[PDB]
Amino acid sequence: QPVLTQSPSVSGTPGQKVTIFCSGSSSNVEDNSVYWYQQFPGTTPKVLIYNDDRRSSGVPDRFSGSKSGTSASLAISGLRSEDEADYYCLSWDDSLNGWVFGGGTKVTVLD
Amino acid sequence: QPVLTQSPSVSGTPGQKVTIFCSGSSSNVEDNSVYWYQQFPGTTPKVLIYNDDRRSSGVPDRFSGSKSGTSASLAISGLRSEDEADYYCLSWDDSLNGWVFGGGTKVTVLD
Numbered sequence: 001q002p003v004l005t006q007s008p009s010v011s012g013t014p015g016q017k018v019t020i021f022c023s024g025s026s027s028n029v030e031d032n033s034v035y036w037y038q039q040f041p042g043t044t045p046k047v048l049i050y051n052d053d054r055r056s057s058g059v060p061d062r063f064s065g066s067k068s069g070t071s072a073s074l075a076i077s078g079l080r081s082e083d084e085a086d087y088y089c090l091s092w093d094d095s096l097n098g099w100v101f102g103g104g105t106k107v108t109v110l111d
Numbered sequence: 112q113p114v115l116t117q118s119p120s121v122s123g124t125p126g127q128k129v130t131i132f133c134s135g136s137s138s139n140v141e142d143n144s145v146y147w148y149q150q151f152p153g154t155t156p157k158v159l160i161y162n163d164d165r166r167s168s169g170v171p172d173r174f175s176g177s178k179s180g181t182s183a184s185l186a187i188s189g190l191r192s193e194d195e196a197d198y199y200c201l202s203w204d205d206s207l208n209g210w211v212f213g214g215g216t217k218v219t220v221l222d
């Protein structure tokens with residue numbers, strides 16, 4: 001099972017400010033760079049955030065990443081319909097000595 | 112600005128599981144009692160969780176609090192209409208020597 005903890009499903013309506021969370025521990029999120037990627041069903045992932053809080057080229061400005069201790073978050077400032085996708089976080093883990101991942105949060109955009 | 116980090120909002124439909132997050136630091140959430148309260152517009156707030164994970168008397172079974180590392184969460188297992196409210200976390204902060212708060216997560220329950 002995924003080492004990082006992400007809620008499997010989060011919903012919002014257009015324009016809502018929704019932040020999704022990536023809960024880790026001292027050996028991973030707290031000590032290492034976190035990355036986030038977006039994956040539409042059946043599609044190649046797009047890295048949104050690298051090095052905790054840096055936004056990749058080719059990403060809408062409504063996305064931002066941050067960290068708070070053992071937790072990382074991806075904030076969507078104004079949900080849009082095209083944001084319906086699966087969002088994954090990952091980092092190195094010092095204890096496992098390898099990559100660790102969340103299970104992904106599927107964002108649903110409702111009317 | 113709030114010292115603890117919460118999603119500004121989230122939506123869900125009746126019966127859906129929703130988790131409210133509250134991320135902090137090693138000097139607040141990690142080592143101090145976290146409390147959660149529920150606020151309805153123009154209504155007396157209710158403290159739902161005290162001491163990280165203890166449910167106040169009368170609080171419905173569907174609410175549960177927990178924390179790990181520097182992040183806390185309140186899980187609502189199966190939204191009801193009456194759960195449409197603003198959920199806040201708070202704790203002591205031993206670095207600031209004062210109370211700290213999340214910004215609140217407004218939960219909207221849709222049809």
Ligand SMILES: CN1/C(=C/C=C/c2cc[n+](CCCS(=O)(=O)O)c3ccccc23)C(C)(C)c2ccccc21
Pocket residue numbers: 035047050055056057090099
């Ligand atoms: C370690 N790791 C990864 C690192 C990804 C790094 C970067 C991803 C995207 N951009 C942005 C490039 C476009 S632009 O913004 O620079 O124009 C970067 C820019 C500078 C340095 C690193 C990156 C990914 C691939 C996430 C990954 C996946 C699975 C396991 C491990 C693992």
Ligand SMILES: [Cl-]
Pocket residue numbers: 006007010019020021022105132
């Ligand atoms: Cl989340």
Ligand SMILES: [Cl-]
Pocket residue numbers: 116117118119130131132133216
């Ligand atoms: Cl939240």
